[PDB]
């Protein structure tokens, strides 16, 4: 009985601190998760009425049409960057045909680190200097062009903020996962003592 008491006092110490560890990862995991709820706000700015001018619009301009690269990029159509501007412009086209079935499609495609690939030359378009693209300059171009960008900057700023959060999450409920069954162990050890 006595050598049982001093197992379950060492198994109680050591699922408190897993405890405690678990209540350090969730503060830091939930302050970065509200981070994270303002990205999706800011990948969710993209609305129907946008959609469909891009699909009226006919006229090819020429930062407008970068933005069209980027939402390829994300859906994972394929044809890198290579292909030229004209011939990339009519694939975003059929993606434009209907504007509530492109829409209805972008909730769905967040999904979570969407294509590992994907997001590189993402990367690439957002962190290259020129082209402008940093949301602001796109406006000035053409106003559906800045929501579609924003959007895209929110999802690709986004997926960083989540994946950061994503270990922060695993960190926070490996920890939990341990504390919890550490405390069953202690809880029925305590019973049978």
Excluded at 93 to 116: H, L, R
Aim: glycine share 2%; proline share 5%; aromatic share 6%.
């Amino acid at each position: 009985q006595t050598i049982a008491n001093a197992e379950e006092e060492k198994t109680n110490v050591a699922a408190a601190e897993a405890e405690k560890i678990s209540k350090e990862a969730t503060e830091a995991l939930a302050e970065a998760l509200p981070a994270l709820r303002s990205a999706e706000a800011a990948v969710d700015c993209l609305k129907k009425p946008h959609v469909t001018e891009m699909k009226n619009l006919g006229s090819p301009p020429a930062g407008v049409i970068v933005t069209a690269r980027v939402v390829l990029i994300l859906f994972n159509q394929g044809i890198t960057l290579n292909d030229p501007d004209e011939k990339v412009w009519k694939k975003a086209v059929t993606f434009m045909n209907n504007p509530q079935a492109f829409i209805d499609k972008v909730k769905s495609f967040d999904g979570e680190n969407i294509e590992p690939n994907i997001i590189e030359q993402s990367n690439k378009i957002i962190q290259d200097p020129s082209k402008k693209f940093n949301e602001k300059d796109m406006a000035g171009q053409s106003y559906a062009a800045s929501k579609l960008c924003a959007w895209a900057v929110n999802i690709v700023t986004f997926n960083k903020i989540f994946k950061q959060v994503k270990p922060l999450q695993d960190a926070q409920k490996q920890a939990n996962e341990i504390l919890e069954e550490k405390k069953k162990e202690l809880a029925i050890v305590k019973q049978r003592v």
